[PDB]
Design a binder for this molecule. Structure first.
Ligand SMILES: Cc1cc2nc3c(=O)[nH]c(=O)nc-3n(C[C@H](O)[C@H](O)[C@H](O)COP(=O)(O)OP(=O)(O)OC[C@H]3O[C@@H](n4cnc5c(N)ncnc54)[C@H](O)[C@@H]3O)c2cc1C
Ligand SMILES: NC(=O)c1ccc[n+]([C@@H]2O[C@H](COP(=O)([O-])OP(=O)(O)OC[C@H]3O[C@@H](n4cnc5c(N)ncnc54)[C@H](OP(=O)(O)O)[C@@H]3O)[C@@H](O)[C@H]2O)c1
Ligand SMILES: Cc1cc2nc3c(=O)[nH]c(=O)nc-3n(C[C@H](O)[C@H](O)[C@H](O)COP(=O)(O)O)c2cc1C
Length: 616
């Protein structure tokens, strides 16, 4: 990327004394950064949030040139305790630099967690490194946990952070409070249709005029060739889709991920407009009131409210506390204005109400507008407050050795009864489920997508043994692994053992790729096809039980055969239980104490022989 000029100079030229950097992948850290940046005004200060990737952090050395200057880092962790893609350069710089940061004042809030090994790795590193470099910490490191409730961890940290800042710099709670807007509304009663965004992510008309290379800013509209129901029963809906990436020049390997940009439910969009009495077809733009910022709009503009609510805004996840806080002013019934205002509390009934009535109940914006009927905010402000609609990732279920021009997806459609009382539908899966191949040329079901390279890969040597554990939709990446493994064999190569440990409720309910797997097994592509049917008997039978059963042979492949272990699917419980079972296997056949088995297994991970492709 081409770097922006010195952030320190921008701050000087714009009267800013605090800058907040975000290492964000799915926007969580980015949003916290903006919240902190906006907070500054309430304390006699002025800040800006910034993407570290667009700057050279070596300029931190010049920050002391600004009086009462301070830098805050909101850093989330990804991969294997890595830094977010956008924080890679900063991370590389921190280890390599020897620059002296004497005079620099900092604070760090990490978006870390517990269902992962190095929980909050990045956050801890930045906070530690800046100090080593000579900078002085102005407030304790924050350790947020997305497994419980990050929002609340942030609220807690934030509540103590500002007072600490005011006391150190000797500033007053000046601003106190008062509704402030980041963007101004400009309605376009004309506008040449050719310059109105209709859902594209980057360059205007980029969805209609496709031009490579394609990525997150320029997605490729892949035609949906196939979309079929995978499960045999009716309990749920599991689907297999095939996206045509021919002529896109996109490359991929088994184990990578495919991201898609979905469209919200039209009915839901319609109702929001209706309940607010807003005309959704109004063409408009929301322009930053700060003419100096590079963030000219909250989303592609000009555009209609309908398009924004459909392709650019998140209207289904529970609104964050600051959003409800800003909306409170539009609730005409006192008790309702009060509940909304108190959602941002660090303790008490207001906090409990938020955790239960909003988060736990999974109340999206429309639900709140319906249940607190006096809340009728203007459409333009709400659009400024809502977070951006994020792309959804899927473990590519095919091998490029076999399907170089097609990317496959295996997904379960999300649809559940929320405690809010309504049925919530998953944005991307509901949208993907409705995509229909059409028929030859009559209608073209297109899916905006791009590929994100992962580190989940089959061994370089075809002879290395492979142990795959992926129950449920965790089978997704392994279909690619297996197609490729079978391919290698077909190509005359010597392939080591390939074992699949799969699981589903019942063979006649949701045994995904039943036919394909049976075929691969029959042809020898799969050395063993171990399937745990969890509900075909009174007790549970899970993949870990099969692993325990085969402990002796697996240990042989692991300790003597240099086998590679892969775990995909549920990251919350399955992955951990599977990990624990491997601990026990190693502990028995080592032999060695549990503590040592853990180390042994954690080493396999570091040496690239124990990989994960899990999610929640
Ligand atoms: C690297 C990676 C790979 C992935 N690979 C796959 C894959 O191969 N296949 C696949 O199916 N998915 C996969 N996912 C999950 C995928 O990205 C989507 O999250 C999933 O398909 C649902 O998206 P959605 O937009 O339909 O749902 P959304 O509208 O985004 O809603 C999902 C949210 O709803 C909530 N939720 C769901 N069920 C309930 C319930 N019963 N009660 C309360 N809350 C609930 C949760 O908070 C969840 O976060 C992957 C994720 C990552 C990060
Ligand atoms: N937030 C929520 O409330 C919520 C609720 C449901 C699902 N989800 C999400 O939706 C996804 C469901 O994916 P899926 O359809 O592919 O999986 P799935 O069908 O639910 O499960 C696959 C197989 O794994 C078994 N299993 C359950 N717990 C296990 C454990 N601890 N260890 C080993 N095996 C276990 C299941 O048996 P049994 O089911 O009989 O135990 C089943 O046979 C998950 O990634 C999850 O994050 C979220
Ligand atoms: C694919 C994936 C990998 C993750 N890996 C880690 C990890 O190694 N350590 C950790 O503490 N959290 C991990 N998390 C959780 C994030 O750190 C946490 O959800 C954070 O709030 C995300 O912030 P963001 O939206 O700003 O990127 C992971 C989340 C996803 C989706």
């Amino acid at each position: 990327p081409v770097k922006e000029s010195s952030f320190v100079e921008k701050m000087k030229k714009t009267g800013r004394n605090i800058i907040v950097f975000y290492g964000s992948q799915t926007g969580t850290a980015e949003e916290f950064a903006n919240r902190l940046s906006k907070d500054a005004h309430r304390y006699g200060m002025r800040g800006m949030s910034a993407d570290p990737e667009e700057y050279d952090l070596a300029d931190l050395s010049s920050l002391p040139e600004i009086d009462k200057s301070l830098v805050v880092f909101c850093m989330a962790t990804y991969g294997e305790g890595d830094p977010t893609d956008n924080a890679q350069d900063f991370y590389d710089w921190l280890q390599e630099t020897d620059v002296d940061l004497t005079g620099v004042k900092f604070a760090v809030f990490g978006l870390g967690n517990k269902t992962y090994e190095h929980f909050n790795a990045m956050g801890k590193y930045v906070d530690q490194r800046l100090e080593q470099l000579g900078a002085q910490r102005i407030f304790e490191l924050g350790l947020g946990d997305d497994d419980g409730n990050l929002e609340e961890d942030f609220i807690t940290w934030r509540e103590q952070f500002w007072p600490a800042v005011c006391e150190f710099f000797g500033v007053e709670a000046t601003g106190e409070e008062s509704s402030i807007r980041q963007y101004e509304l400009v309605v376009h009663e004309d506008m040449d249709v050719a310059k109105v965004y209709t859902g594209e992510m980057g360059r205007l008309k980029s969805y209609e005029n496709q031009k490579p290379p394609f990525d997150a800013k320029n997605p490729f509209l892949a035609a949906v060739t196939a979309n079929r129901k995978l499960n045999q029963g009716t309990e749920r809906h599991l689907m297999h889709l095939e996206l045509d990436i021919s002529d896109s020049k996109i490359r991929y390997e088994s184990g990578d991920h495919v991201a898609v940009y979905p469209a919200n439910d039209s009915a839901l969009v319609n109702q929001i407009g209706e309940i607010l009495g807003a005309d959704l077809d109004v063409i408009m733009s929301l322009n930053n009131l700060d003419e100096e910022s590079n963030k000219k709009h909250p989303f592609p503009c000009p555009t209609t409210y309908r398009t924004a609510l459909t392709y650019y805004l998140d209207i289904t996840n529970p609104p964050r506390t600051n959003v409800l806080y800003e909306l409170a002013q539009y609730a005409s019934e006192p008790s309702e204005q009060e509940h909304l205002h108190k959602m941002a509390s660090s303790s008490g009934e207001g906090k409990e109400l938020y955790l239960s009535w909003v988060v736990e109940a999974r109340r999206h914006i429309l639900a709140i507008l319906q249940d607190y009927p006096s809340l009728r905010p203007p459409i333009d402000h709400l659009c400024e407050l809502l977070p951006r609609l994020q792309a959804r990732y899927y473990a590519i279920a095919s091998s490029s050795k076999v399907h170089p021009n097609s990317v496959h997806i295996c997904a379960v459609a999300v649809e559940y009864e929320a405690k809010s009382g309504r049925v919530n539908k998953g944005v991307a899966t509901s949208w993907l489920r409705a995509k229909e191949p059409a028929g030859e040329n009559g209608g073209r079901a297109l899916v905006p997508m791009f590929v994100r390279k992962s580190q989940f890969r089959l061994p370089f040597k075809s002879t290395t043994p492979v142990i795959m554990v992926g129950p449920g939709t965790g089978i997704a990446p392994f279909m690619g692994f297996i197609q490729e493994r079978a391919w290698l064999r077909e190509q005359g190569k010597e392939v080591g053992e390939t074992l699949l440990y799969y699981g589903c409720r019942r063979s006649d309910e949701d045994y995904l790729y039943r036919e394909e797997l049976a075929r691969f097994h029959k042809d020898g592509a799969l050395t063993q096809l171990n399937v745990a049917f969890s509900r075909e008997q009174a007790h549970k039978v899970y993949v870990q039980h099969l692993l325990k059963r085969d402990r002796e042979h697996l240990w042989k492949l692991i300790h003597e055969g240099g086998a590679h272990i892969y775990v995909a699917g549920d990251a919350r419980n399955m992955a951990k239980d599977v990990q624990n079972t491997f601990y026990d296997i190693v502990a028995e056949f080592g032999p060695m104490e549990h503590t040592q088995a853990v180390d042994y297994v954690k080493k396999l991970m570091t040496k690239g022989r124990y990989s994960l492709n899990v999610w929640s």
